[PDB]
Amino acid sequence: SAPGVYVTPKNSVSSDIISIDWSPVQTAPYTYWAVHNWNQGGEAGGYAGFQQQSGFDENGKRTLHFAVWDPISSKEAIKAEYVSPTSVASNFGGEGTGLKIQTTYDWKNYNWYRMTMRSWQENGHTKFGQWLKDVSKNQWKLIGIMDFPVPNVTFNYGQTLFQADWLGNGQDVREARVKNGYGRNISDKKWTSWNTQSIEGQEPLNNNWDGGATSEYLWFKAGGDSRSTIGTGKTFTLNQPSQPEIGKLDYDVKSTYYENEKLNITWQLKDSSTPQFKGKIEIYNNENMTGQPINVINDIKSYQNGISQSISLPTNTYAKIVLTDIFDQTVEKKVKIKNESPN
């Protein structure tokens, strides 16, 4: 009932990582800020963002949202591979069909939240993952991963943000801000900066919305006494760097021992680290890690913090722990395996 508002990059391209920063200002109930959108009308169509599901403030139900529509070219189901502790996966229907993950998340007005999605190929399927950085708390969280049963799909086209009223409370104002929009290109793994974006009301004949920019962010609002100062829409440019500011992967190894024919290797990322994408461990029979490993543990997931494995090992082994973050930064540590360690 409030008119929709779309904020669209001028220069987006097919991507495997998409990122934007968002801050809520006015939060009417029944508002979805879908900060990422992809593949509309197409294979692996989806979106993700933030909702005010009820109430006008922090005492209402505030959530993250993530949905992918059912495959066109397969009868196989989308799987919810991982959901965070405050996340719930369910099948949606009556609006096409597909999978959504709704996550209770206590986001706050005038604070910034970075939503970063990554898509990757694995096992002949495509995975889509949702990560969120609470900027004020300097903390990343893995929210959910969907396993889509079609290969070679990406965030191919259609990058945009919308603010929408889904229930019909047009008297109530909704307003938010965005900045730091970036994609990682499929073509060359370089970053594209969405420094120029267009703000445009959904209904050309409805001016009950507004938008603009400061030096730091784009802002938009709709509903109530909102009235456009920019006609049907306008393009704005932010002074963001051509390259995104990417943190560092940093972790502590917490165990590395072998006892009673069980190998246990675990770690904890620092609270200030970029989030874990994947891990691998190679076990060598020698300190220099020459030759072939005697054992390899592959495909440790984003949501796994190490291994416990029934295994036979000789006396003097060494572990090569190779962790990679969601930005493909790798940090490798070598650790001597403590033979007997509860002991």
């Binding site: 509309q40 009308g41 009556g94 929408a164 889904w166």
Partner: peptide
């Protein structure tokens, strides 16, 4: 209940 999108026009 529904949270729609648009296809390209």
């Amino acid at each position: 209940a529904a949270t729609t999108t648009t296809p390209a026009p």
